[PDB]
Amino acid sequence: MHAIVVCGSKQYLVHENDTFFVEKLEAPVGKEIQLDKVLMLDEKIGAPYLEKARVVCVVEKHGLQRKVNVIKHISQKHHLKKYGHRQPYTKLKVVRFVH
Template sequence: MFAVLKTGGKQYKVQAGDVLRVEKLDAVAGDKIQFNEILMVDSTVGAPLVAGAAVQAEVIEQIKGPKTISYVKRRRKHSSQRTRGHRQQLTLLRVTDVLASGAEKSGVKAATGTADARRAAHEAPGAAKAAPEAAEKPKRARKAAEAKE
């Protein structure tokens, strides 16, 4: 049984036992995670997702991709040049199971990217510090209020 899953803005065709390199996920080595955005399972095509389908995987490790080097040279009068390197953060996974249905009852943690995890932590209740009302007002408004008093 195979499935097409979506993560990190990319789509992957997987089956049990496959090893994947995907964009960095919020998980550590040894964690079991579950992908819930499944576009296709065998001959079932979702519109846009297949309801109840999931792919379970085990995190092998967090790795860095190969180094890519970009070189920019401007010619003519400025004669400036710049070399810049980059290594993408990746997560290495081993697909353990493809579920055609029953994803909600599995009890496995959903796979989230690091950006999703930061966003969720930021929006969590109690994450924002309680600021006094005076600090929320702009400086001009505070001065105007003090001048009236």
């Protein structure tokens, strides 16, 4: 029915055939992974996680979120620096999560 995935420390409840974005994890683009850090597939709850149940995840793209313009300026003190933090992401979907 769906799947809870813990990417880092961030959870995603994503249903079947939904392409969504997580933090970049150097995943292979366009390939298939048996992800284990999963929970709550379909009325299915395990105490620490979903034992003997893993999700089958395919990736579509690797990109970066738009440039976070981090600026450090102090008023009337002349401490001003600029940088761009483009946090990367992996856009992926679940296909045939196994039980």
